[PDB]
Design a protein around this ligand. Structure first.
Ligand code: NA
Ligand code: NA
Ligand code: NA
Ligand code: NA
Lengths: 388, 388, 388, 388
């Protein structure tokens, strides 16, 4: 049989994996090795695994390829390495990239500073307006780069529309699908060419692995592996990290269901609360791109942003008053995580520059975990009441 | 007390490490985490660990910094990532690098193809001739890059002399110290600015970790961390890999002593053998740069190359006749590893091009392990006798 | 705050765990150490951790204690070690145990052969009939031992009733709660004194850890630790196994929900199938002790047994015809597992002796996993159709 | 070829291990699995691995069997589990054991209290006097149990002589070889029937694994596995712990050489020091059983005990004044460990009872590590000078 034919939950559990033919071991063994041995000079020449590949990591790459409906996968040392290995494989001096402005922070630094120092220019646009992408394209544009949903207000990008635009002008579309996971969104099915994830978030899900994955056509992935990893970033994933990610992703379906069920309850609670001015969540019909979300996403996700009354000091008081939610900058973990960018990560940044970046003084971001939603709601209500 | 004051074996065991103050645990705990939590909004802003750093990996970086007599260390996903994170941190389009030609293979691809595609030009020279390095320097030269000893005939580069030349012309010297480990050679003490290793080889030593390390001044390492890793390669080392490397490096001193004691015995045996035309080993007085080796290296290393009578077919027969030595392309493991580049790794490469690269049809490379030297010698003698 | 006050899902995620006070690490660090160090002679005497305890394993023990509503937990090397460490701590030569007959196989060997060789006699009874337990009690009875649900037909034992009987006659009740997990059944809340689990099954859930847990009063657990583990079995759990179990148990709630939702669908399908003579599942109203199950269990579990038409050869053909279900003797994993005891595990056992043990020639046992239930059903239907 | 024919260092590296036939992986894969799968009903019946065995742990057991020159090995959860699994497999109510009195502490509790509660009586004797062993034997004696060298003064037991006595009277000899490792002593070669180790000490050597090993005839080991582990202690070793022990034992030869070379230097220093009244070390000719040690042990070991002038307070001051040596109760680690039993572990024990146990107020025990011996000596001298 072929796991590409089975239901998505079945694929999550089985795809890329099989019992060890040699031993019958059901768990994928951890091939924690650097060295692979040949039986003869002839076998040595023939193969020329190699530890540009590894049997454990191979299982993870094959699984994620099945889940994203792509041909092949490539695991990396971090989400940022998945992004840079991809873009540095595709681009050389003189090339151009059109990127969404609403992207993850260290992606922005790589595109803003690193790429131009290698002769690769980047134009940043508002990707919620596909016409801005079209207008920014140039004869030298190799790649359009988008993230959806995007920080910090969970705005969306119409993947199918953008893919059509990119392709008409001879560029590839790369989509960072980290926030959704393949359980909730499948960019390749909508016309994207390449998907990247930080598996650090939902794919692993257990807050104990830093890692990335790239999924795309075999022809591209081979280049990302034999040139990008081998000759540029060196960002390979360790076999133990691959094994942990394989283990975490086993529960991706049930975890995403619970994250999203919890998040919807919490988003509705926050929307009903008189001390909360705004709530950003694709699952609320008041979301600016609600209907696009319903077509493109199977679930509205586990992340919520919201603005508390009273600006900077209220937001600080609120996060200082939670008892259950944990203060941290990651997302996609089993524990509910909360952060207040204006007092935490962006405190040195000038208020008016924060504002330009969509970060208001009162904005809180919440990564909803697997706890009982009544407990998370009660904790939020407690902290909100105190802060306001 | 301060481990920088203690003997080298004491440093190998203790430097960068201490019992866990919280629990008393002697082994460095494995901080297998992606997420770090803040106790308040204020603590969050203050720190802005972060998982651009990790307590386990920090211990490894501090240890290797002590051992190389550098200020700071930075762990990476692979030896190649240590090299590319370094050079991509230092160089931008329009910059120039002078590199030894006798370098590790995937370093050569990065320098030959990847760097020029980012607008960074590289001149390759014979670094055994320091005048060639001087002659190749340009106003835009940022870095001189060397490896010593170098594949495939274990030629040397005079680190102190090259450092003086590089510095006089305003460039940094980066040295790949992988083959020696800090137990046998200390490039920073000889004037190098930056040392890189693949810890995949001797530093870990157990053939089960792919990883790299960079050691240098705090000011440089900070840039390699906060720009190179964060914004370019994303090549961070996982905490488990760091923990395994910490564990492997505990025995670095006793392992290097045994590797080198074994290697000298084997090199002398091979030098006495009438079916072996040449033996390349820094420990033999017939080595072209023997006296330089005696000043610059505390031991002559665990690697030997040698040429067997009868060219390509003899070399193939020989490696096909070993019973104890294992056929593989890595080095620095506890097991003795052997390879015949002409029939294994370089078989597709044209004979005359192999020859230009110092790879003769009969050249065998041997990574000497920790087995009884009489057993390794008996195995070699057996295979040589059969092959010739 | 106190996690004993929060909802069960919140407890599953958080109980026994907290960010590392020293570093802020959210994941419990893996304290993979044998050695703990003292700061002074005085601190050494004072503590006399010790590695009869470990910070990682402590977190697991505290979590499971919260989840079972017991005072304290003790982790072990295997489920069987949890059982034997308990019973060998409690019993000495001349003591007596009343045990259910319908128990796990290697528990039966320990009770049948090992215990009597140490002078500890065991009476086996049908624990579905509490009067049989009462009738078997003796002045020297220290322990009543039960498992519920029990193999192979998922019969039940009324925990509250049995606890009352045991206590009236001055004995402790120990319950193996492995099949249910604390998510579905809480024996201590029903009057049991001690709960044991093989965490190898649902608690870990990922088919990659062998381990056990014991939960009970602090006074008993201290004895099981400082006498049973230290001075009898030596069956301690490794910190890495504890860390993996902590990680697996994070998803216990969502996993048990899905296992049981899937199992109910499959049990109903099997009950409607004309080639299946019997289906044993607590979730079917036709189950002999259905109402007892509804009071004592919050969900009916992820395990089903059923009898296929055509006896031994039909059962063999059926398991040889599945494509998705994996043939194995474990349970509680994310993958659906299937076994046919009469042709697999009990083939050497005489047919009439198998029959006495409740194992008919046509009995199949199924551990329902997290795959799509339609896929599991389609696979079963396919194999059943072929086999019959 | 057969590793039983090779030199001991070669065996240490290679025995029990081979590249993975399926993949070529040189490192033994970590089979971190609980579940093994069958390809058919027939294969299921046939095997009835099983996770009473595991491919990773199997490699460790086979290696240690080669190194001790025994037929078979069995890994366990701890050294104490190796001991109790052995003795509870061999003995039943009514049986008798003759044991050395000078044994490891938690072995003493198991023999003194646990065994008699199961109807198994134990006679303790001074095993340095083989006549005391003979005089204590009874018709029901199944086992003679010895440790050599023994705590706390490193007295010896003549293994060959004791084996002859045990055998003449129809008993087995079990030897705890933990202090020596098979590199320094081979009890089976001297007539012992069974060897046990805590691998927690030198075999693993890295202070990060708790575990045990049993080595003996296939017929016995099968019983220890299929009855002792399966049906009594449940004390199996986890595959990750086995993998770490495999990795640690790779350097056993070079580690034991350095431990013993360091220890001899330190013992000679202490013997020359006027504030040290006694030094116990088999490598000093003043050792009461020096010549026996020279025949039975290939090296004199890495452990030293010594008495400091000034009794209890001097010993306390001394250990409170070390800067490099770490205060801990384990041994065989890469770091030098020191303890003062009278002020640390035996402080509650009455002075006259301590004295009976060979523990004087001034006795210090030292586990010599791999640091530079001059540094350890300088640290000891510093602390001794201060304390006296
Ligand atoms: Na991004
Ligand atoms: Na290099
Ligand atoms: Na049981
Ligand atoms: Na002992």
């Amino acid at each position: 049989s072929d796991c590409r034919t089975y239901g998505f939950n079945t694929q999550i559990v089985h795809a890329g994996q099989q019992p060890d033919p040699s031993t019958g071991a059901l768990s994928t063994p951890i091939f924690q090795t650097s060295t692979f041995v040949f039986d003869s000079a002839e076998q040595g020449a023939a193969r020329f695994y190699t530890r540009l590949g590894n049997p454990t990591t191979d299982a993870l790459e094959k699984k994620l390829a099945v889940l994203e409906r792509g041909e092949a996968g490539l695991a990396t040392a971090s989400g940022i390495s998945a992004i840079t290995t991809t873009l540095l494989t595709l681009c050389q001096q003189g090339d151009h990239i059109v990127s969404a402005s609403a992207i993850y922070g260290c992606t922005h630094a790589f595109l803003s500073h690193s790429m131009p120092k290698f002769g690769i220019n980047v134009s940043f646009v508002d990707a919620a307006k596909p016409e801005e992408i079209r207008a920014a394209m140039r004869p030298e544009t190799k790649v359009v780069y988008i993230e959806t949903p995007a920080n910090p207000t969970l705005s969306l990008v119409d993947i199918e529309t953008v893919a059509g635009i990119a392709h008409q002008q001879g560029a590839l579309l790369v989509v960072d699908n980290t926030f959704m996971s393949p359980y909730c969104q499948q960019p390749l099915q909508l016309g994207a060419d390449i998907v990247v994830h930080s598996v650090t978030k939902y794919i692993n899900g257990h807050g104990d692995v830093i890692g990335g994955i790239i999924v795309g056509k075999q022809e591209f992935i081979d280049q990302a592996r034999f040139v990008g990893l081998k000759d540029i970033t060196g960002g390979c994933m360790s076999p133990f990290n691959a094994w942990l990610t394989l283990r975490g992703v086993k529960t991706l379906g049930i975890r995403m269901e619970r994250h999203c069920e919890n998040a919807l309850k919490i988003a509705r609670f926050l929307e009903g609360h008189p001390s909360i001015t705004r709530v950003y969540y694709p699952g609320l019909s008041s979301h600016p791109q609600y209907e696009l979300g319903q077509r493109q996403m199977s679930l509205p996700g586990g992340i919520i942003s919201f603005e508390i009354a009273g600006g900077l000091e209220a937001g600080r008081r609120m996060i200082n008053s939670v008892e259950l939610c944990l203060l941290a900058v990651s997302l996609g973990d089993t524990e509910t995580l909360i952060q207040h960018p204006a007092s935490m990560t962006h405190s040195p940044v000038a208020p008016e520059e924060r504002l330009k970046a969509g970060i208001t003084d009162g904005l809180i971001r919440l990564s909803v975990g697997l706890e009982d939603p009544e407990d998370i709601i009660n904790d939020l209500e407690h902290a909100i009441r105190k802060a306001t």
